[PDB]
Write a protein that binds this ligand. Structure first.
Ligand SMILES: [Cl-]
Ligand code: NA
Ligand code: NA
Lengths: 198, 192
Protein backbone atom coordinates (compact mmCIF):
# COMPACT_ATOMS: atom_id res chain seq x y z
CA UNK A 1 0.00 0.00 0.00
CA UNK A 2 2.61 2.53 -1.25
CA UNK A 3 2.65 6.32 -0.67
CA UNK A 4 0.85 8.37 -3.41
CA UNK A 5 3.61 10.93 -3.78
CA UNK A 6 5.83 8.07 -5.03
CA UNK A 7 6.81 7.72 -8.62
CA UNK A 8 4.84 4.90 -10.25
CA UNK A 9 7.42 2.09 -10.43
CA UNK A 10 5.55 -0.16 -12.93
CA UNK A 11 5.32 -3.36 -10.87
CA UNK A 12 8.95 -2.93 -9.72
CA UNK A 13 9.77 -3.15 -6.01
CA UNK A 14 12.71 -0.72 -5.74
CA UNK A 15 13.58 2.68 -7.18
CA UNK A 16 15.85 5.70 -6.30
CA UNK A 17 14.19 8.95 -7.43
CA UNK A 18 16.35 12.03 -7.90
CA UNK A 19 14.80 15.13 -6.40
CA UNK A 20 14.67 18.52 -8.02
CA UNK A 21 15.88 21.61 -6.08
CA UNK A 22 12.72 23.68 -6.64
CA UNK A 23 10.57 21.05 -4.91
CA UNK A 24 9.47 21.54 -1.28
CA UNK A 25 10.51 17.93 -0.80
CA UNK A 26 14.10 18.73 -1.79
CA UNK A 27 14.22 22.03 0.13
CA UNK A 28 12.94 20.70 3.42
CA UNK A 29 15.67 18.04 3.42
CA UNK A 30 18.28 20.58 2.32
CA UNK A 31 17.18 22.95 5.15
CA UNK A 32 17.22 20.15 7.72
CA UNK A 33 20.76 19.28 6.57
CA UNK A 34 22.04 22.88 6.42
CA UNK A 35 20.61 23.59 9.92
CA UNK A 36 23.86 22.02 11.19
CA UNK A 37 25.95 21.39 8.05
CA UNK A 38 26.19 24.80 6.44
CA UNK A 39 29.86 24.28 5.61
CA UNK A 40 29.08 21.25 3.33
CA UNK A 41 27.45 21.34 -0.14
CA UNK A 42 24.76 18.98 -1.46
CA UNK A 43 25.30 17.25 -4.81
CA UNK A 44 21.89 15.49 -5.03
CA UNK A 45 19.05 14.13 -2.89
CA UNK A 46 17.38 10.85 -3.88
CA UNK A 47 14.12 9.53 -2.66
CA UNK A 48 14.30 5.84 -1.79
CA UNK A 49 11.24 3.82 -2.88
CA UNK A 50 11.56 0.33 -1.47
CA UNK A 51 8.13 -1.40 -1.39
CA UNK A 52 9.16 -4.25 0.95
CA UNK A 53 11.05 -2.21 3.53
CA UNK A 54 8.27 0.39 3.45
CA UNK A 55 5.62 -2.31 4.07
CA UNK A 56 7.53 -4.03 6.94
CA UNK A 57 8.40 -0.66 8.50
CA UNK A 58 4.80 0.57 8.33
CA UNK A 59 3.47 -2.57 10.01
CA UNK A 60 5.88 -1.97 12.90
CA UNK A 61 4.80 1.69 13.03
CA UNK A 62 1.15 0.62 13.27
CA UNK A 63 1.99 -1.82 16.06
CA UNK A 64 3.95 0.77 18.00
CA UNK A 65 1.13 3.31 17.48
CA UNK A 66 -1.25 0.72 18.94
CA UNK A 67 0.95 -0.31 21.85
CA UNK A 68 2.02 3.20 22.91
CA UNK A 69 -0.40 5.74 24.42
CA UNK A 70 -0.86 8.44 21.71
CA UNK A 71 2.91 8.90 21.48
CA UNK A 72 4.89 10.50 18.72
CA UNK A 73 6.64 7.33 17.75
CA UNK A 74 8.62 8.34 14.69
CA UNK A 75 11.43 10.88 14.25
CA UNK A 76 13.28 11.88 11.09
CA UNK A 77 16.96 11.32 11.71
CA UNK A 78 20.36 11.06 9.98
CA UNK A 79 22.70 8.23 9.38
CA UNK A 80 26.15 8.73 7.74
CA UNK A 81 27.38 5.76 5.71
CA UNK A 82 30.31 4.69 3.45
CA UNK A 83 29.64 4.34 -0.29
CA UNK A 84 30.17 0.62 -0.08
CA UNK A 85 27.12 0.16 2.24
CA UNK A 86 24.76 2.25 0.07
CA UNK A 87 23.52 -0.62 -2.20
CA UNK A 88 22.83 -2.78 0.91
CA UNK A 89 20.99 -0.01 2.83
CA UNK A 90 18.89 1.05 -0.19
CA UNK A 91 17.77 -2.54 -0.61
CA UNK A 92 17.78 -4.02 2.93
CA UNK A 93 17.83 -1.11 5.36
CA UNK A 94 19.95 -0.85 8.50
CA UNK A 95 21.46 -4.00 9.96
CA UNK A 96 22.60 -3.98 13.63
CA UNK A 97 24.93 -6.89 12.83
CA UNK A 98 26.77 -4.62 10.36
CA UNK A 99 26.94 -1.48 12.54
CA UNK A 100 30.25 0.02 13.61
CA UNK A 101 30.92 1.14 17.16
CA UNK A 102 29.99 4.76 17.98
CA UNK A 103 32.63 6.99 19.67
CA UNK A 104 30.17 6.99 22.59
CA UNK A 105 28.30 3.70 22.90
CA UNK A 106 24.72 3.40 24.27
CA UNK A 107 24.14 -0.09 22.92
CA UNK A 108 24.77 -2.54 20.09
CA UNK A 109 22.28 -1.38 17.49
CA UNK A 110 21.98 1.13 14.65
CA UNK A 111 22.67 4.80 15.48
CA UNK A 112 20.68 7.73 14.19
CA UNK A 113 21.60 11.36 14.75
CA UNK A 114 19.32 14.36 15.41
CA UNK A 115 21.93 16.66 13.78
CA UNK A 116 23.26 16.19 10.26
CA UNK A 117 26.59 17.56 11.62
CA UNK A 118 27.03 14.42 13.62
CA UNK A 119 26.45 12.10 10.62
CA UNK A 120 28.63 14.37 8.43
CA UNK A 121 31.78 13.37 10.37
CA UNK A 122 34.32 11.49 8.21
CA UNK A 123 34.07 8.67 10.79
CA UNK A 124 30.40 8.01 9.79
CA UNK A 125 30.04 9.34 6.23
CA UNK A 126 33.44 8.29 4.90
CA UNK A 127 34.53 10.15 1.71
CA UNK A 128 34.39 7.83 -1.32
CA UNK A 129 37.35 7.84 -3.75
CA UNK A 130 35.77 10.90 -5.46
CA UNK A 131 35.32 12.97 -2.29
CA UNK A 132 31.62 12.26 -2.05
CA UNK A 133 30.12 11.77 1.37
CA UNK A 134 26.76 9.95 1.94
CA UNK A 135 24.07 10.38 4.58
CA UNK A 136 20.55 8.87 4.83
CA UNK A 137 17.48 10.73 6.03
CA UNK A 138 15.55 8.11 7.95
CA UNK A 139 12.13 7.61 9.48
CA UNK A 140 12.98 5.93 12.80
CA UNK A 141 10.58 4.41 15.30
CA UNK A 142 12.06 5.87 18.47
CA UNK A 143 8.81 5.33 20.42
CA UNK A 144 9.36 5.56 24.20
CA UNK A 145 12.99 5.79 25.06
CA UNK A 146 15.47 5.82 27.90
CA UNK A 147 19.19 6.51 28.23
CA UNK A 148 21.09 3.50 26.83
CA UNK A 149 24.28 1.81 27.90
CA UNK A 150 27.17 0.24 26.08
CA UNK A 151 26.27 -3.39 26.79
CA UNK A 152 22.72 -3.37 25.41
CA UNK A 153 21.83 -5.98 22.84
CA UNK A 154 18.13 -4.94 22.92
CA UNK A 155 16.55 -1.93 24.63
CA UNK A 156 16.23 -2.38 28.35
CA UNK A 157 12.95 -3.36 30.03
CA UNK A 158 10.74 -0.49 31.25
CA UNK A 159 10.44 -2.38 34.59
CA UNK A 160 13.07 -4.98 35.71
CA UNK A 161 10.29 -7.25 37.09
CA UNK A 162 8.81 -7.46 33.62
CA UNK A 163 11.87 -8.13 31.45
CA UNK A 164 9.99 -8.55 28.16
CA UNK A 165 8.11 -5.20 28.10
CA UNK A 166 10.83 -3.07 26.47
CA UNK A 167 11.59 0.56 25.62
CA UNK A 168 11.38 1.02 21.85
CA UNK A 169 14.79 2.67 21.57
CA UNK A 170 17.59 4.30 23.61
CA UNK A 171 19.23 7.71 23.53
CA UNK A 172 22.35 9.46 24.83
CA UNK A 173 20.29 11.78 27.07
CA UNK A 174 16.49 11.95 27.41
CA UNK A 175 16.58 15.64 28.50
CA UNK A 176 18.39 16.54 25.20
CA UNK A 177 18.43 13.62 22.73
CA UNK A 178 21.13 13.84 20.05
CA UNK A 179 21.21 10.12 19.03
CA UNK A 180 18.93 7.14 19.14
CA UNK A 181 19.83 3.44 18.89
CA UNK A 182 17.43 0.85 17.45
CA UNK A 183 17.94 -2.88 18.00
CA UNK A 184 15.46 -4.53 15.54
CA UNK A 185 15.04 -4.81 11.74
CA UNK A 186 12.40 -2.66 10.01
CA UNK A 187 12.36 -0.12 12.87
CA UNK A 188 13.96 2.41 10.49
CA UNK A 189 13.04 3.33 6.88
CA UNK A 190 15.80 4.94 4.76
CA UNK A 191 13.74 7.64 3.06
CA UNK A 192 16.32 9.86 1.27
CA UNK A 193 19.96 9.61 0.47
CA UNK A 194 21.92 12.87 0.46
CA UNK A 195 25.06 12.91 -1.65
CA UNK A 196 27.34 15.72 -0.50
CA UNK A 197 30.80 17.13 -0.62
CA UNK A 198 33.23 19.69 0.79
CA UNK B 1 -4.96 -14.13 12.44
CA UNK B 2 -5.23 -17.87 11.71
CA UNK B 3 -8.54 -19.72 12.29
CA UNK B 4 -7.30 -22.44 14.69
CA UNK B 5 -6.27 -19.67 17.08
CA UNK B 6 -8.88 -19.39 19.79
CA UNK B 7 -10.56 -16.17 20.87
CA UNK B 8 -8.22 -13.59 22.44
CA UNK B 9 -10.81 -11.37 24.15
CA UNK B 10 -9.26 -8.48 22.24
CA UNK B 11 -5.74 -9.23 23.57
CA UNK B 12 -2.71 -9.17 21.25
CA UNK B 13 -0.83 -11.94 23.06
CA UNK B 14 -1.71 -15.21 24.80
CA UNK B 15 -0.39 -18.72 25.42
CA UNK B 16 -3.01 -21.42 24.96
CA UNK B 17 -2.46 -24.83 26.42
CA UNK B 18 -3.49 -27.51 23.91
CA UNK B 19 -5.97 -30.23 24.78
CA UNK B 20 -4.33 -33.68 24.61
CA UNK B 21 -5.84 -36.19 22.13
CA UNK B 22 -7.32 -33.58 19.82
CA UNK B 23 -6.06 -33.03 16.33
CA UNK B 24 -3.85 -29.95 16.88
CA UNK B 25 -2.00 -31.55 19.83
CA UNK B 26 -1.67 -34.92 18.08
CA UNK B 27 -0.15 -33.25 14.99
CA UNK B 28 2.53 -31.41 17.02
CA UNK B 29 3.21 -34.36 19.40
CA UNK B 30 3.71 -36.62 16.34
CA UNK B 31 6.34 -34.20 14.94
CA UNK B 32 8.22 -34.32 18.23
CA UNK B 33 7.91 -38.08 18.96
CA UNK B 34 9.15 -38.80 15.41
CA UNK B 35 12.57 -38.28 16.97
CA UNK B 36 12.03 -37.91 20.75
CA UNK B 37 9.73 -40.83 21.67
CA UNK B 38 11.83 -41.37 24.84
CA UNK B 39 10.90 -37.91 26.21
CA UNK B 40 7.69 -37.25 28.07
CA UNK B 41 5.47 -34.34 26.97
CA UNK B 42 4.15 -32.28 29.92
CA UNK B 43 2.18 -29.87 27.77
CA UNK B 44 2.07 -28.05 24.45
CA UNK B 45 1.03 -24.42 24.13
CA UNK B 46 0.05 -22.53 21.00
CA UNK B 47 1.71 -19.09 20.89
CA UNK B 48 -0.75 -16.46 19.76
CA UNK B 49 1.34 -13.37 19.25
CA UNK B 50 -0.55 -11.04 16.90
CA UNK B 51 2.35 -8.57 16.28
CA UNK B 52 4.95 -11.26 15.54
CA UNK B 53 2.48 -13.07 13.36
CA UNK B 54 1.68 -9.94 11.35
CA UNK B 55 5.34 -9.15 10.71
CA UNK B 56 6.05 -12.77 9.85
CA UNK B 57 3.12 -12.96 7.39
CA UNK B 58 4.24 -9.74 5.70
CA UNK B 59 7.70 -11.26 5.14
CA UNK B 60 6.16 -14.56 3.98
CA UNK B 61 4.13 -12.70 1.33
CA UNK B 62 7.13 -10.66 0.15
CA UNK B 63 9.22 -13.89 -0.15
CA UNK B 64 6.36 -15.68 -1.96
CA UNK B 65 6.34 -12.77 -4.47
CA UNK B 66 10.12 -12.55 -4.70
CA UNK B 67 10.80 -16.29 -5.18
CA UNK B 68 9.88 -18.19 -8.36
CA UNK B 69 7.14 -20.60 -7.19
CA UNK B 70 9.05 -21.82 -4.11
CA UNK B 71 7.89 -23.48 -0.88
CA UNK B 72 9.34 -20.85 1.40
CA UNK B 73 8.15 -22.05 4.77
CA UNK B 74 9.29 -24.97 6.96
CA UNK B 75 8.31 -26.24 10.39
CA UNK B 76 11.47 -26.52 12.53
CA UNK B 77 12.52 -26.81 16.18
CA UNK B 78 14.40 -24.65 18.60
CA UNK B 79 15.52 -25.64 22.11
CA UNK B 80 15.64 -22.82 24.61
CA UNK B 81 16.48 -22.49 28.33
CA UNK B 82 13.57 -21.60 30.67
CA UNK B 83 14.68 -18.04 31.31
CA UNK B 84 14.51 -17.16 27.60
CA UNK B 85 10.95 -18.50 27.17
CA UNK B 86 9.04 -15.24 28.06
CA UNK B 87 11.25 -13.21 25.66
CA UNK B 88 10.79 -15.67 22.79
CA UNK B 89 7.02 -15.86 23.43
CA UNK B 90 6.86 -12.08 23.10
CA UNK B 91 9.64 -11.21 20.66
CA UNK B 92 10.77 -14.40 18.84
CA UNK B 93 14.39 -15.39 18.21
CA UNK B 94 17.08 -12.70 18.16
CA UNK B 95 20.38 -13.31 16.40
CA UNK B 96 21.98 -10.73 18.80
CA UNK B 97 21.56 -13.11 21.76
CA UNK B 98 21.79 -16.68 20.27
CA UNK B 99 29.43 -22.31 12.71
CA UNK B 100 27.17 -21.44 9.76
CA UNK B 101 26.60 -17.76 10.40
CA UNK B 102 25.57 -15.24 12.98
CA UNK B 103 21.81 -15.91 12.69
CA UNK B 104 19.26 -17.96 14.59
CA UNK B 105 19.38 -21.74 14.25
CA UNK B 106 16.44 -24.07 13.69
CA UNK B 107 16.58 -27.89 13.66
CA UNK B 108 14.83 -30.30 11.31
CA UNK B 109 14.70 -32.99 14.04
CA UNK B 110 13.41 -32.49 17.62
CA UNK B 111 16.27 -34.76 18.74
CA UNK B 112 18.76 -32.01 17.82
CA UNK B 113 16.97 -29.41 20.00
CA UNK B 114 16.42 -31.95 22.82
CA UNK B 115 20.16 -31.76 23.59
CA UNK B 116 20.78 -30.24 27.04
CA UNK B 117 22.99 -27.52 25.57
CA UNK B 118 19.94 -26.23 23.63
CA UNK B 119 16.95 -27.13 25.75
CA UNK B 120 18.66 -26.69 29.11
CA UNK B 121 16.82 -28.63 31.87
CA UNK B 122 15.43 -26.23 34.44
CA UNK B 123 15.47 -26.75 38.22
CA UNK B 124 12.49 -29.14 37.93
CA UNK B 125 14.19 -31.11 35.11
CA UNK B 126 11.82 -29.48 32.62
CA UNK B 127 13.07 -28.87 29.08
CA UNK B 128 11.54 -26.52 26.51
CA UNK B 129 11.60 -26.38 22.76
CA UNK B 130 9.59 -24.46 20.19
CA UNK B 131 7.97 -25.62 17.02
CA UNK B 132 8.71 -22.77 14.65
CA UNK B 133 7.53 -21.63 11.25
CA UNK B 134 10.68 -20.61 9.44
CA UNK B 135 10.99 -18.68 6.16
CA UNK B 136 13.83 -20.81 4.80
CA UNK B 137 13.07 -19.74 1.20
CA UNK B 138 15.90 -20.45 -1.25
CA UNK B 139 18.94 -21.61 0.72
CA UNK B 140 22.61 -22.44 0.31
CA UNK B 141 25.38 -23.90 2.44
CA UNK B 142 26.41 -21.58 5.30
CA UNK B 143 29.87 -20.94 6.68
CA UNK B 144 31.26 -19.19 9.78
CA UNK B 145 31.14 -15.40 10.10
CA UNK B 146 28.18 -14.77 7.71
CA UNK B 147 26.02 -11.85 8.95
CA UNK B 148 23.47 -12.28 6.16
CA UNK B 149 23.03 -15.10 3.72
CA UNK B 150 25.28 -15.11 0.63
CA UNK B 151 24.12 -13.43 -2.60
CA UNK B 152 22.46 -15.76 -5.12
CA UNK B 153 24.76 -14.39 -7.81
CA UNK B 154 28.04 -12.65 -6.82
CA UNK B 155 27.34 -10.09 -9.60
CA UNK B 156 24.11 -8.88 -7.98
CA UNK B 157 25.53 -8.71 -4.46
CA UNK B 158 22.29 -7.47 -2.73
CA UNK B 159 20.07 -10.22 -4.11
CA UNK B 160 20.39 -12.71 -1.25
CA UNK B 161 19.55 -16.31 -0.43
CA UNK B 162 16.85 -16.51 2.31
CA UNK B 163 18.60 -18.86 4.70
CA UNK B 164 21.64 -21.08 4.89
CA UNK B 165 22.04 -24.69 5.98
CA UNK B 166 24.76 -27.21 7.00
CA UNK B 167 24.02 -29.51 4.04
CA UNK B 168 21.85 -28.49 1.06
CA UNK B 169 21.09 -32.02 -0.20
CA UNK B 170 20.17 -33.23 3.29
CA UNK B 171 19.73 -30.27 5.74
CA UNK B 172 19.62 -30.86 9.54
CA UNK B 173 19.60 -27.12 10.44
CA UNK B 174 18.73 -23.77 8.92
CA UNK B 175 20.08 -20.35 9.88
CA UNK B 176 18.04 -17.19 9.22
CA UNK B 177 19.52 -13.69 9.62
CA UNK B 178 16.58 -11.32 10.06
CA UNK B 179 13.89 -10.70 12.62
CA UNK B 180 10.78 -11.46 10.63
CA UNK B 181 11.77 -14.94 9.39
CA UNK B 182 10.78 -17.22 12.31
CA UNK B 183 7.43 -17.45 14.10
CA UNK B 184 7.36 -19.35 17.45
CA UNK B 185 4.15 -21.34 16.94
CA UNK B 186 4.11 -23.94 19.77
CA UNK B 187 5.98 -24.43 22.97
CA UNK B 188 6.63 -28.05 24.09
CA UNK B 189 7.50 -28.51 27.73
CA UNK B 190 8.96 -32.03 28.24
CA UNK B 191 11.24 -34.26 30.32
CA UNK B 192 14.09 -36.70 29.58
CL1 LIG C 1 17.99 -26.04 18.76
NA1 NA D 1 -2.25 3.43 21.28
NA1 NA E 1 6.72 -15.82 -7.04
Amino acid sequence: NLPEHWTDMNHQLFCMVQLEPGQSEYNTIKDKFTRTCSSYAIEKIERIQNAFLWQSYQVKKRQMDIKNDHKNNERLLFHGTDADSVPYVNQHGFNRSCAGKNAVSYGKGTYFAVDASYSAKDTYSKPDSNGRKHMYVVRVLTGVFTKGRAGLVTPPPKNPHNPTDLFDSVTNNTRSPKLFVVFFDNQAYPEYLITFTA
